[PDB]
Amino acid sequence: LTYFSARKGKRKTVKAVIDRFLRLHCGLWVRRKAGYKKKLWKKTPARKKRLREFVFCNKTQSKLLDKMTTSFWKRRNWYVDDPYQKYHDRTNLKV
Amino acid sequence: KNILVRMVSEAGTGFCFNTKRNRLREKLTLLHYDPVVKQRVLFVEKKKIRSL
Amino acid sequence: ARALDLLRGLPRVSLANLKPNPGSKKPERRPRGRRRGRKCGRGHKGERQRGTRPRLGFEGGQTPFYIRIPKYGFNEGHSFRRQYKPLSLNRLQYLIDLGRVDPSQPIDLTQLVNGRGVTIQPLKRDYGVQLVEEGADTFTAKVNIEVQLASELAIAAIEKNGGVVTTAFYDPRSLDIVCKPVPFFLRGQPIPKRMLPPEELVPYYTDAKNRGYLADPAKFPEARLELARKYGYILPDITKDELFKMLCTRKDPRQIFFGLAPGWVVNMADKKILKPTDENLLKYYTS
Amino acid sequence: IPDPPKHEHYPTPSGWQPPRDPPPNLPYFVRRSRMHNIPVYKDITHGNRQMTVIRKVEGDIWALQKDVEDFLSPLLGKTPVTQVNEVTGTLRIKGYFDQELKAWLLEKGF
Amino acid sequence: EFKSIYSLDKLYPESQGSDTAWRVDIPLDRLTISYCRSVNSKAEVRFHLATAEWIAEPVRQKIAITHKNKINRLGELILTSESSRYQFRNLADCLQKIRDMITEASQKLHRIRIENMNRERLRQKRI
RNA sequence: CCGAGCCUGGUGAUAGCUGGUUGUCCAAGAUAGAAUCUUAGUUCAACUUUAAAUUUGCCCACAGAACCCUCUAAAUCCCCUU
RNA sequence: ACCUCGGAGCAGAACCCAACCUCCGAGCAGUACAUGCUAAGACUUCACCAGUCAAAGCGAACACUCAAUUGAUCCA
Numbered sequence: 039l040t041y042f043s044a045r046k047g048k049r050k051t052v053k054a055v056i057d058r059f060l061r062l063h064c065g066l067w068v069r070r071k072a073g074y075k076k077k078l079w080k081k082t083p084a085r086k087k088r089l090r091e092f093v094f095c096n097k098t099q100s101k102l103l104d105k106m107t108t109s110f111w112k113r114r115n116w117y118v119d120d121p122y123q124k125y126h127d128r129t130n131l132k133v
Numbered sequence: 134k135n136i137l138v139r140m141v142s143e144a145g146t147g148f149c150f151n152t153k154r155n156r157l158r159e160k161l162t163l164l165h166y167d168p169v170v171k172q173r174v175l176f177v178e179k180k181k182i183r184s185l
Numbered sequence: 186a187r188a189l190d191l192l193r194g195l196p197r198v199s200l201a202n203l204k205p206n207p208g209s210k211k212p213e214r215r216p217r218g219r220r221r222g223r224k225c226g227r228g229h230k231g232e233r234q235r236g237t238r239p240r241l242g243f244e245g246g247q248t249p250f251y252i253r254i255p256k257y258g259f260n261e262g263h264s265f266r267r268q269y270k271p272l273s274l275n276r277l278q279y280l281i282d283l284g285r286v287d288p289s290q291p292i293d294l295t296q297l298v299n300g301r302g303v304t305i306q307p308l309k310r311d312y313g314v315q316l317v318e319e320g321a322d323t324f325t326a327k328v329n330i331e332v333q334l335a336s337e338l339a340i341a342a343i344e345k346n347g348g349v350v351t352t353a354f355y356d357p358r359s360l361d362i363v364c365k366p367v368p369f370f371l372r373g374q375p376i377p378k379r380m381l382p383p384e385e386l387v388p389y390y391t392d393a394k395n396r397g398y399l400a401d402p403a404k405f406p407e408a409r410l411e412l413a414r415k416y417g418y419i420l421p422d423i424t425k426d427e428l429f430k431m432l433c434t435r436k437d438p439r440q441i442f443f444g445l446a447p448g449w450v451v452n453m454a455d456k457k458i459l460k461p462t463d464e465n466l467l468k469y470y471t472s
Numbered sequence: 473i474p475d476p477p478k479h480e481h482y483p484t485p486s487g488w489q490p491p492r493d494p495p496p497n498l499p500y501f502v503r504r505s506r507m508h509n510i511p512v513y514k515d516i517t518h519g520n521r522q523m524t525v526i527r528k529v530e531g532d533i534w535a536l537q538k539d540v541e542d543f544l545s546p547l548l549g550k551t552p553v554t555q556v557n558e559v560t561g562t563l564r565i566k567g568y569f570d571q572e573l574k575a576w577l578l579e580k581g582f
Numbered sequence: 583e584f585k586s587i588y589s590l591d592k593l594y595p596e597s598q599g600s601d602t603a604w605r606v607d608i609p610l611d612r613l614t615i616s617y618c619r620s621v622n623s624k625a626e627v628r629f630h631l632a633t634a635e636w637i638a639e640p641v642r643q644k645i646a647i648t649h650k651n652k653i654n655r656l657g658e659l660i661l662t663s664e665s666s667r668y669q670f671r672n673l674a675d676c677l678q679k680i681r682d683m684i685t686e687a688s689q690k691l692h693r694i695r696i697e698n699m700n701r702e703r704l705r706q707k708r709i
Numbered sequence: 710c711c712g713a714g715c716c717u718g719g720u721g722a723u724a725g726c727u728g729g730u731u732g733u734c735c736a737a738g739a740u741a742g743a744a745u746c747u748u749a750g751u752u753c754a755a756c757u758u759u760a761a762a763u764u765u766g767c768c769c770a771c772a773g774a775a776c777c778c779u780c781u782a783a784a785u786c787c788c789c790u791u
Numbered sequence: 792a793c794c795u796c797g798g799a800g801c802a803g804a805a806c807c808c809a810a811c812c813u814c815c816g817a818g819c820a821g822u823a824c825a826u827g828c829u830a831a832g833a834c835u836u837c838a839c840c841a842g843u844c845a846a847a848g849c850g851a852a853c854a855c856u857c858a859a860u861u862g863a864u865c866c867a
């Protein structure tokens with residue numbers, strides 16, 4: 039990535055990550071399963087259900103995605119009707 | 134020797150499913166579940182999507 | 186203090202005497218000596234050690250994780266999304282109790298911001314304040330409040346105590362102006378008229394249930410009564426209250442401030458208001 | 473910041489209670505913040521180390537440490553592990569006891 | 583003082599009076615309301631069904647028959663909501679339950695049925 | 710010093726390759742792999758280091774972990790107590 | 792000739808592990824047409840990506856056989 043811009047001298051976001059991932063404020067990243075739109079005719083209903091899921095990422099994956107995005111993408115957003123609003127905060131988490 | 138075809142329901146319109154069919158056979162008419170009308174209804178083949 | 190008594194005996198504090206607080210200043214490490222610098226933390230010779238290690242996200246040739254995942258519109262129109270800062274009834278009560286906001290006067294965005302109860306960022310696409318149901322119980326305050334969004338339960342809580350809640354729209358420009366009036370006054374430009382809600386937001390602000398500012402006032406009584414029936418409280422009669430005039434008072438649409446008409450110039454230095462006289466200007470500002 | 477207005481009944485609906493006049497006769501005094509709240513704060517470090525701090529402390533802070541230990545002993549069974557910062561007048565406690573300590577300092581008259 | 587073309591008097595000509603906006607069937611006084619901190623709060627609503635004049639006589643009779651389980655020793659109908667953090671919404675659910683109860687009065691089991699039928703068969707003898 | 714002259718500039722070209730990388734003292738510290746135009750390299754895991762939180766970790770005893778092929782051992786996993 | 796997947800020599804007995812080699816096979820097909828929807832807990836080809844099993848529930852009826860029988864992102 040661009041650590042320092044030529045114009046502003048600022049860290050840049052990788053726009054690929056924004057197109058593919060959602061960041062929850064708590065630090066988790068959400069993604070679609072790969073190949074969920076692909077060749078559904080030859081796939082079992084159980085497998086199709088597994089594919090049609092929003093899944094969280096590894097610690098290592100999360101750390102990668104954090105570095106590849108600026109602080110703007112990590113801010114608390116109060117969207118008017120956000121389907122992922124409840125998932126922004128963690129409850130009853132011990133260590 | 135098999136082709137993937139689209140099956141469209143007569144009722145609960147706008148719902149369809151894909152099934153494989155022998156190429157040399159006639160057009161399929163099936164009785165399949167429709168979630169829009171929440172019942173089993175008749176489906177007809179409209180066109181062949183691909184050949185597998 | 187005992188420490189000041191200690192100071193009395195000690196030599197005078199000078200620029201010679203000073204030191205940083207322990208733990209504040211970590212030692213700087215530099216590649217000199219047996220330990221810190223021979224390969225200098227860089228390990229054995231390779232791509233990493235030469236300093237030419239490939240970009241973040243590159244997996245050495247394998248299709249990268251971030252690329253492998255399909256695109257989905259999680260952030261499709263994040264910028265064009267409207268955002269509303271939540272103000273709990275709990276927080277509102279706290280502000281009233283601590284005297285940060287004045288319930289005797291109408292409570293607005295300016296009043297909330299001046300009380301520093303809420304922080305509104307006009308940029309970052311905040312469209313104002315959302316009143317939320319949190320702290321509905323143990324809210325005992327009679328207020329005339331104007332918010333951009335209000336939940337059913339929050340409206341019920343306000344009305345139970347004999348208060349009045351209204352729902353208003355502020356466009357980005359007027360929202361900036363209303364939240365920070367003093368900087369705007371220093372800009373020199375006359376007060377603009379607040380633009381009407383976008384087409385999609387019009388039905389919300391014209392609904393009596395939401396307590397919209399553009400809604401029919403004749404529709405308000407039965408709306409209030411139905412809300413009272415639902416949550417099982419006797420609906421207070423506002424007319425009987427001596428603060429009826431205060432509870433009634435609302436800024437009409439196309440008016441940012443309570444006593445200031447659009448088109449007026451505030452001259453703060455000499456403490457005066459300048460009003461246009463030209464027919465064209467008056468027609469423009471009134472419309 | 474405006475002075476909080478006088479209420480006929482305390483505590484307020486929000487739960488706010490003014491400091492006792494005259495101040496309690498104790499070796500230590502805990503001063504309110506600018507916003508007239510008890511200065512007890514939760515703290516987290518390493519994402520697992522949970523702490524509570526009492527901040528604006530004047531006088532004998534060691535007296536406060538002993539009293540805090542005595543208060544928290546029945547709740548924990550064990551004596552709470554604490555740090556005393558004489559310089560800054562701060563007392564730090566391992567674990568979250570923000571609500572308990574706030575209530576305690578309120579009843580003590582701070 | 584200032585009035586625009588989008589002022590409410592102009593928008594709605596029939597509504598002009600200030601009081602018009604602020605002008606004013608279960609009796610809440612009759613009902614007894616209690617709150618318990620059971621996390622979701624708990625609200626309990628109790629009222630004497632027999633002496634409840636606001637409900638119609640045949641409706642009382644039908645409610646007593648249908649909802650006999652909720653009836654106390656003293657004859658008080660008790661209904662409870664523990665579905666919400668806010669006691670407001672809990673009270674609302676209780677009141678709605680009362681409304682639905684009145685309405686329904688106005689206008690798993692297979693196992694039990696077989697057991698009862700079998701009991702009847704065994705009873706088939708004379709003195 | 711011509712399989713494409715020389716000079717200057719771009720240019721501090723690029724080099725997963727070669728060579729080098731400068732005070733003192735102490736401490737912890739070694740060999741499962743996967744993918745890769747990939748095996749002179751890199752990314753993830755494994756191991757290693759630090760700090761923090763909390764409870765178990767290791768050693769283990771009875772019991773327990775398949776037939777088929779007609780054979781098959783040293784062993785291993787699991788595991789209270791200690 | 793080979794590069795991907797499945798089986799045997801091949802870890803004699805949890806798992807994993809025999810490069811190179813010597814052999815075999817796979818790149819389908821058949822029957823359903825609820826091969827609907829949803830959801831505890833798990834397994835996992837030593838990472839990731841992928842892949843696998845499944846209680847309960849809703850709706851039906853009175854989550855197929857086969858060792859592999861397969862292909863991410865973009866884009867159209």
Ligand SMILES: [Mg+2]
Nearest residue numbers: 219220221738
């Ligand atoms: Mg060394």
Ligand SMILES: [Mg+2]
Nearest residue numbers: 222223730731
């Ligand atoms: Mg040397």
Ligand SMILES: [Mg+2]
Nearest residue numbers: 228229230231
């Ligand atoms: Mg190296």
Ligand SMILES: [Mg+2]
Nearest residue numbers: 229230231749
């Ligand atoms: Mg080397």
Ligand SMILES: [Mg+2]
Nearest residue numbers: 235721723724
């Ligand atoms: Mg170089």
Ligand SMILES: [Mg+2]
Nearest residue numbers: 735736737738
């Ligand atoms: Mg050593």
Ligand SMILES: [Mg+2]
Nearest residue numbers: 246247745746
């Ligand atoms: Mg390749």
Ligand SMILES: [Mg+2]
Nearest residue numbers: 746747748750
């Ligand atoms: Mg190579």
Ligand SMILES: [Mg+2]
Nearest residue numbers: 232725749750
């Ligand atoms: Mg190399």
Ligand SMILES: [Mg+2]
Nearest residue numbers: 767769788789
């Ligand atoms: Mg053991």
Ligand SMILES: [Mg+2]
Nearest residue numbers: 835836837838
């Ligand atoms: Mg694994």
Ligand SMILES: [Mg+2]
Nearest residue numbers: 742743836837
């Ligand atoms: Mg292998």
Ligand SMILES: [Mg+2]
Nearest residue numbers: 846847848854
């Ligand atoms: Mg089932």
